[model samples]
Target chain A: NFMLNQPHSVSESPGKTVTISCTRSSGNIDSNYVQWYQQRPGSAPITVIYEDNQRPSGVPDRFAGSIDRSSNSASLTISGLKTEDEADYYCQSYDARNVVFGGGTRLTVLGQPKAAPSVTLFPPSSEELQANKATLVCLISDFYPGAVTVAWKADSSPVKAGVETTTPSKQSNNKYAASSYLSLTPEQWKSHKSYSCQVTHEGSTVEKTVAPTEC
Target chain B: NFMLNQPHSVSESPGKTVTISCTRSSGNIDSNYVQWYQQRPGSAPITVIYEDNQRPSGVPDRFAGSIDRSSNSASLTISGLKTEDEADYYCQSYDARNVVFGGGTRLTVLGQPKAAPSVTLFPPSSEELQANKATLVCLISDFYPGAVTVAWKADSSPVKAGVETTTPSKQSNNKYAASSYLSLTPEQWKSHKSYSCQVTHEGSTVEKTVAPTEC
Candidate 1:
């Protein structure tokens, strides 16, 4: 019934040590046993620690699980980190027979350079005219170390309303892609000279513009 | 684009050793590196072995990864297994950077007694009459060991063509449940006096009967 809070992502270099924490939103941390699982991309999760501090028979001791009653949190500590250890880790516990899982923490072992995302902005489709509204789509793809911020602009000015963006999702090639959409009414579409989608990845900005040729 | 074939399930008692195998249906066994993942119910997959036989920094040696070129397969062997080792294990490999995953094998750590499923047969809903078909649903819940066989019977005789049963799925309580469907034409539904859904879980059978009361 309580939420388990975890960092969205954690970064560390190889041979370093990193710890992921899971904070309990409302209950005592020691009320139940906490377990930790590691999930690599495109695969199921494996148990690294079961019943709090106990490592499973096949799990190494370098992966340690602990509970901090003072902070009402659980932590998974990984020492001698390797690039292969880059995966998502989650902490889980049970509350009166109901399973509760943390949001998950993505571990990034930094060695490779960060790659910026490629951005493409598309004009509204022909069919959008029938609905009396135009929808502009921005596709962001092939990004490494996938943290990106997207913004919408119209006529060289920022546009806020009717803008929706999705979180970056993993693609088949182990990179990431995300999409952002902007909606505009027919009147607004024709009035604006151009629309642009700006993406910032790794502190570099990529902006793509589309003119309202259909209108 | 090749297939990674794995056994559907495996079983071993505590303190014993178990090996789950993954056979490559095509391509050379050594063409690419094979990785193994472990997944428990309701959690994401974790890497147990990576790059065919390399264990990540935190993974223990009890979990060994190997490749047998003789069989064109890869194997994950766990020694001195414990109850916590019970999980679904999967083998993954890449073909030209395309990720391919095995079907996954459920490892049962035997110590707890197997529990039979509770079967409930539901009569076809009134709305199904409009479709000219009666769809009877059999819900089997709270089963242990996960493997079950289901059969349908009408008027004390075996029925097959319209019977479809699903693989057992985990429930919130850590048990398993499966559903079986029996489809029949309206004419056949009215003519049959009764229909039965018989489920066999671990050699114990539980059958539930439903008559065509709505018809």
Candidate 2:
């Protein structure tokens, strides 16, 4: 019992050519093998292609790997495409005894080079509003096409009761980071006089303010 | 790309019932979701059946989770089983961006109350054999089900050669600990007088001799 069908995201364009596909809910890639990893968003998980198409060491043959055998599925062609190959791509298998995956397709690749994200906005001092509660983090650092959008304010309006946000993480040069907290109280943190944190990635917008300091 | 199809070990017999399974490769759980975790021996991994069946809060309904869909696989029965459920059993999914695990499966839960494993044998002090190297550590403590089988002796014979063993790890109560390293050359450790460290496990056999005393 095993499965694999992949496709989630694939926007493409840097030189074109993007395949992805994984398929396989049973077995018989001739006899089972099919690997192919390559995550970069924080690192770890790099095996380009193994089992059947081989490529392990240093991997870079324009990233290729295949095995369709009618439809047991496997494929991972990348030819030309670059922007450091976007990121996320997983597909590994084994059915006779557990070990499978293939649900990580996020390629994206596009082009040009766009990054812009570094906001910060701590707030919450005075010994943390004297313990009555007050968080407000929002760090957001180094970014890229990994979508970003944090937000929060106070002296302006949009506070959106207890926002949390977080799940962008992946920075080790591969760019991407995130955070967002925002609690409140201590009597709304002394009636807040300013607090912003905004951030919007790629297209622009950055923000970061703080005030009403003291415990 | 995520995967799971466990069964590297599964003995069973405390209250019967056992199921395990976790098939998925290349990807397709139809719409998404399938989880089940529970690792004892050195904890951290609890979630026992979620998504396909839920059960998070405290987890105990004899643990149950299903989804076959004509064999895309995803089981986890359990019923009675208990003995702390023995330990080890993973299987998560999601290949749309990362998060995949399922290479674990060692249930066991057999009887006899097992126990028996406490081998020590250090040998390598005098300033660590004066750094000319001559290590010889073999700890193997507590233990249960986590397979153990280290061996190395220099008098009882059967040592084989520079042994290295280690891969039992898991200790924080669920029991299991291992370590085995035996290099040599302090002139074969001052011409070896005696040296041993043998641990078999579960069927019993625990040794620990150490002559060449002072490094």
Candidate 3:
């Protein structure tokens, strides 16, 4: 029954520091293998701190970890915080036989609202058709805070399989960009029908569809 | 009833291919996500494959995954296997509020028993050791097949709190190394006159002990 307790939410702004605490209740808390993960809505969670303090290689430097042994708590602090950091942050602990996740904190970074992403749908190329595979790409750009969702559909039917979506990565201009890929078979891309990529940003939706370009 | 099954043990030689499979029981198996994890002795499992066939970026090509939906099975194939791939394989499934893990498989890359690990105990260096805490590390090296157990005792009494161990990792010479940590307060470390690190590999026992250093 060893689990984690966390604050529900935090409202902050750019250039501030936010510390999210996870209290270990019920069992021994080593805090040595404690890890922190960032999960944006509709995307996979990424490990920011592993084994208590080490960032998995290539992770950004802004994420830091600390442990308060007396209170049986661990915290993940984000320095020079940005709006893009407004996601659910979870602290996970791994023991010999147990895995536990803190109830995540939804960090709402208050600021000026950014524009909706410009969504583009690209059909599979001819070379991909010859290989019996079609990859459709959904490019989402110029979004703020990176909390966007993308969905794929074939002729208004949900396309559920073979879809790969990257976490929204920060753009050099301080905006955000992400891409989603939908892999299809040669038969599904006859171009005799329509496929769509829909992006939802701040309640505004944009979609792109095309009838078979490679076909 | 949801469950998973895999081969209990696999003995193969280096440079040969090895395949481990997970056969799932209960409910629907084609629910679009079958994750495979790699775990070495004393270490937390690392995700190698997820959602049927996607490698979570930077995973090597040798670890390939496939799913046979009709048979309700998922397979992980480690081709061109090296001694480094000797570890346990576990398949995980997440469906409809139920999570299941395959009984892990231990793959032994057959070779000489070579030797049991040469274990050593070390305390954290000067700058890191706080007055209220001590972090002791048990280093295990030069072992084979990577199946080993590490335990700690203080003055002949089992020490359980604040223990964390890394999985056995491959060394440069095709051997394996792993580390376990013990954290206790200065008062406790002082009362605990003798601390021992015991390791078991290939039915052999090796140990190293020391009195409290930082305390």
Candidate 4:
């Protein structure tokens, strides 16, 4: 078994930048080649960094990676932080041999007090069967400094409001996790409709979506 | 259940360029956003292409990708083919909305007159737990036309062989498959142990390697 120790949690205010470090147990990796992944609950991980500091094609320039070969450690620095950066961060390595991934670090963004709960929706289950309409529930437990806004989209297109949604609440974690429900019709689902839940935290946005599936 | 008719495998002669096409079931994806992966036995899949035609930074330029959005299809083209490309090729999509991968297509680079197999040894696997030694095996199979030389390398350096490798036989598919194995001692494996199997076919080079693992 491999173990990765991440900082408990860091609080960053809007416009401030934060850096997270990941250290591996073995020094057998080539520092020149490191990759990073960003993921939320119930979604495939996104490639944020590759080949050390080189960001993948679609990644925004705000996210960056740096390596310290001597210490066998890598750090990801996200600049111009917005509430959207409040997700989980992970480090990946291809040490010219086997592949490895760090446990994961969660980032919390402090927002304005007036902020509402931010909600996201995902397929109730990990896999979406073919031709079946799926529903996702995004629950916001608590929020520290700001309000949240929830938006829905299907296949990258905006989802009309008449659809169903739920309100978020404060959770025991001293943070607010909001819940939103997205319903896809059988025909829409069969057409490979992609349902996405977008949460606007202050000026930043964090969005997650479900993929179209055959089974 | 959703049914997809997989494409037929591509059969091409050595030195000939070949392209594999991946057509999605619906227009949910943009052809410009495709990715590709390559995987060999017992190894995890690696991303070969991302953001459509762009090869990841370290990838060789010989690998190319193109798309026809109207047809919902993406094509990956490899030019000046080598037997190394014979492994499975899969196309993927990264639209930030969903991730999708096409069933892989295996490419066979046909040849004639067959090839001779060669092996090189670095250091034998360690008999102790703390000793770091590795043994690697390379097998090339099913060449319709033929092949030429197969040899091994240590840490990109050449390894001299004191033993002869066994000859491979012709398989029922009318193709020839050959394998070579090498062992390395722990100290040698840690210091300079990297084993590679290279084959020359019709002036083209196809090679595979098993890198040393650190414990």
Candidate 5:
């Protein structure tokens, strides 16, 4: 098994420089060729750097890739960062049998301030109750810097089972939106348990609580 | 000046709940009653939530509107989210003599992962370039989520001065296809700069770059 680790995000003002690093967990950095891809929201991934430091014929020279054997890492460095350079960058490589990709890094060219997300919690409805299932949904919207962590709690205890959260997607206004779901049985719903959806974005947490009585 | 800020997009799985918010920027949110509209592709806008928190006669109770004094914002919430509930929602309000509308928010009911478009970039022929103008064509096909952004760059610099992207049209296969054109002067084309057409969809990006010397 192999794992590639990269920073979750990096931000800088325009005209500055930013370098995203991808480190291999269990292999020599120089043993295999490395490639980097850039994905903007709603688009396919495109290769920018291939074969470890080789720029594609059409890619600009501003995007340069380099491997560091000393650190067992590869770096994709973009110079003279423009707002247009804002995108998710992924670094990938393959060993003899496995191909691994670093968790993508969101590069934000900071021109606008970070926007806090609006969180809303919805309780299970009658139709859902008739089906003997209760689903709690948490809607998150209007956030900048799309990354957010979601947690579901019944009363005060964390609920890990049957929890699903979507990756944040871009809105036409360039803000981000996402949703989280928690499923329960009819028995659990009738017990009048309080559930909370907690969303953490930009180092702050927004929590919304719901119960059967609220609806 | 008055403005209503809304999320760019919001999505949730079917049988879940989602909410879109509209925030007042320059006036008290409660000064005027807020109205919300739902519009699907190629369809006229219809009222869903209106008069602050009232649902229309034909509209189901699953669609709701609310105002939050603490946040100075309005919300349109859809419970038991279904595919039919997917549409663009717009929030409108008034202040004294001015009426304001928030930028619309696209709602998606997550039934399955939306398809990503295939992209190909074609450079202008020598004959076209010799005629004093060059046109670069970027063809996009096989995408399900019709919303996409196309950006062009020349030598890593944004080339917005002469670029036009078409709205995606539905194909027979139930996918989408669109094209973008970049108009350039022969002098600009002959400058031998690396030009790129970047298409973004579903949190990913694919880009194709071209130059004069090569095809």
Candidate 6:
């Protein structure tokens, strides 16, 4: 029989590096026989390391592994993180004939904020931007738990009371989840000339902004 | 900066559940933010778990995650193992603003022995069967270090000086690896209609087989 304790999850931003750790209850495992796995939705798990510190054949150079045998712990780090790197990770060991696994850690990759070069008032689009009648949709995909918040910001200032947000249940990869939708009027958004959507979770923060387009 | 410690390889069998554990040195992490990833040769890493125990949207039910806060450990477990599970597993965490990963664990899901039937010459095709050349080939894919062994038997009797064999590297998922080949003669194999392959490492028997087709 195999048993494992719990695991820890951390947050990070895109293009930055992240590290995750795993500890064992018993110090009996040989560091040389330890291994790791990486799995995403709709696909099979893949092996990334073996014998504690060595990379298996075909693993990218960016993915690395290490171990501290004396402390009965192992660590993995990924550098130059990208949106595609967001996923769940796990570790395992084979002691004698017994095999065991550790709880997993999830990494939610946040999208980078778009830099504003300059603000120009352009002609309106086919549809008029209305006040209290427009809906702002913020999509944060590949997120776990899928619980989030959507808020409206006018000219960098938080939108006041008349604004209401709704999160509707959505299906992703066969998993039931939801997305944030902030509803407001074009007139209210025009006053600020810009509206932003911010999503905050225990793991990380994601934000996106949209300027009123001419109609 | 992020760093990961991983093994070069690992070995396992089908139907045998397994886990991969990851550890880190930093403290003050929220376990619910953990994540995991899986990758294959020449491809990108995929998300497996997010927000600790919560499987990401669209992930298969066989994959699971858990966390242990006191020890600063997290792990991912895969049940009802299949041959496709023979890939690398890694752990990731959101620490502060950076995303971190653990050294990876390469899970080599071994093929199951064909089942055996009573009153038959051997267990069945589900198990590995012995060859008449007194030689047998045990296909152990996903092994990391490339060092393994095979045993020969006759009518449930152990054969001495069976002259175990080895082979050059073969390509799996585009990576070069090796396998174990046990050699025996037709005369030696006929002397006993039954044989077995016992895989051992560091004096411990990881797996044993009576026939190639028996698995």
Count clashes in each candidate, considering only residues at least 3 apart in sequence or on different chains. Answer: 8, 25, 1, 41, 12, 142
Q: Deviation in angstroms for A192 in model 5?
A: 71
- Cα lDDT tens digits for candidate 1, A99-138: 5778788788975566677565556544345668566666
For candidate 3, lDDT tens digit of each residue in B145-167?
67676789988987777665554
Q: Which scores higher on TM-score, 1 or 6?
A: 1
| Tens-digit lDDT track of model 4 for B92-195 | 55443333446667676676445443222122322221334244434344554534466677768787852123243344344454434444555555566455
- Docking tier of model 1: it is incorrect
lDDT of 5 by residue, A1-215 (tens): 56778998899998888999999999798888887878655543467987899886678899999999999999999998876688888887766444456877889888866999866566664545666767666666668887899998888998878765655666545677665656688787667568888999988999888766533
Each model's iRMS: 19.2, 21.8, 22.9, 26.9, 25.9, 28.8
TM for every model, in the order presented, reads 0.40, 0.31, 0.35, 0.32, 0.42, 0.30
Q: Any runs in candidate 4 off by more than 4 Å, and if so which? A: A1-215, B1-8, B94-97, B118-215
List, for all models, the DockQ compared with the true complex: 0.02, 0.02, 0.02, 0.01, 0.01, 0.01
Measured by lDDT, the strongest candidate is: 1
In the range B1-215, model 5's lDDT, one tens digit per residue, is 68889876677889998989999997678889888878664333466776788765668999999999889999998999988988888897877544467877878776556888766565654444446756666666667666677889898988877665544656556666666667688778778566898998765889987776532
Candidate lDDT scores, in order, read 0.76, 0.67, 0.70, 0.56, 0.75, 0.51
Docking quality tier of model 2: incorrect
Report the alpha-carbon TM-score of model 5 versus the true structure.
0.42
Error of 6 at A9 (Å): 2.9
Q: In TM-score terms, which candidate is top? A: 5
Judge candidate 1 at residue B50 and give its lDDT. Answer: 77
Off by over 4 Å in 3: A116-215, B1-215
Candidate 1 residues B1-215, lDDT tens each? 58899999999998888999999999988999898878766455567897898886677788999999999999999999876687899898766424566888999887856877866566654445565757666656668887889988898999967765555656544567665666688788888898888999888888877776532
Error of 1 at B213 (Å): 68
**Candidate 5: where are CA atoms >4 Å away?**
A1-215, B2-13, B23-33, B67-73, B94-96, B110-112, B153-161, B188-198, B203-215
Candidate 2 vs candidate 4, TM-score winner:
4
Tens digit of per-residue lDDT, candidate 6, span A70-168: 767777788888777776677776555445667666665654332211111111121223212444434333334433444556667876554322222
